[model samples]
Target: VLSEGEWQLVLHVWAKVEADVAGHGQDILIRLFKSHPETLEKFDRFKHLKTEAEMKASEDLKKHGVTVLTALGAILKKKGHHEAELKPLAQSHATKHKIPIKYLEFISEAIIHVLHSRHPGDFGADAQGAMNKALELFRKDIAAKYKELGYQG
Candidate 1:
């Protein structure tokens, strides 16, 4: 469980992230795909994209980015105050998207990268620590849901 102080630090960084949520989402996706191109192959909308310029130009990519981050925003609003808050998201990702839990690690890294790149001053070690802790909870919750759903991959 996060202390109030940790939540405050996370919210401070998230406020900046939410300011340009869509763009940040796109950047996060771009970073994820760039470093972990194998993950990109799982996305029907993006797997066909042949190049970085092509991927960047994709409206599908843009819309999906917004969708992803908006869902993240909803989750953050709960402040990890309860475990069930993320259940719906976990269900959707597990059943509908069939997203592998491993991808969250990459996505989490991208998220932190974007936050740090955009607001170096706001994202110090303590803030980064808070964010990492939050993401760990998220991953754990999602993984549990995946197991319940019998998602083997």
Candidate 2:
């Protein structure tokens, strides 16, 4: 299992995750797309990259970030909402888009990295472990679903 006794860390950091989302959240998406343009192939909207100019991609990122993450406030207000939330998203990415597990995995790491960078003080060993447990559980939750989704859709 990812972790046992101290799940509060997951919720605590999730609280931070909710707090950190901003329009600047666009940067996270831009940077991910920029570094991994093949990742664009993971989206139907981004296939326009074949027919559209380079500048249009970030607009998709910005648009979707606002569209998607605008839910952060509500997401944080409820515990375990993301477990259900990410399942649909992970399933959608895997089945509809054929996204690799690596992409899903890396996104988790990147959020942790962003959180770690933003509040180094918050992630002492306990926090790190909790973050890790959170990741571990999230990873476990998604892995099986993605495998089924990646091929059948």
Which candidate leads in TM-score? 1
What do the candidate models score in CA lDDT, each in turn? Answer: 0.86, 0.59
Q: Which stretches of candidate 1 lie over 4 Å from their true place?
A: 82-85
- Candidate 2: tens digits of C-alpha lDDT, residues 2-65: 3334556655655665554654356555555666677666767755654323634456656776
How many Å off is the CA of 124 in candidate 1?
Answer: 0.7
lDDT (Cα, 0-100) at 79 in candidate 1: 81
Clashing residue pairs in candidate 2 are none
The numbered model that scores best in lDDT is: 1
What TM-score does prediction 2 earn? Answer: 0.66
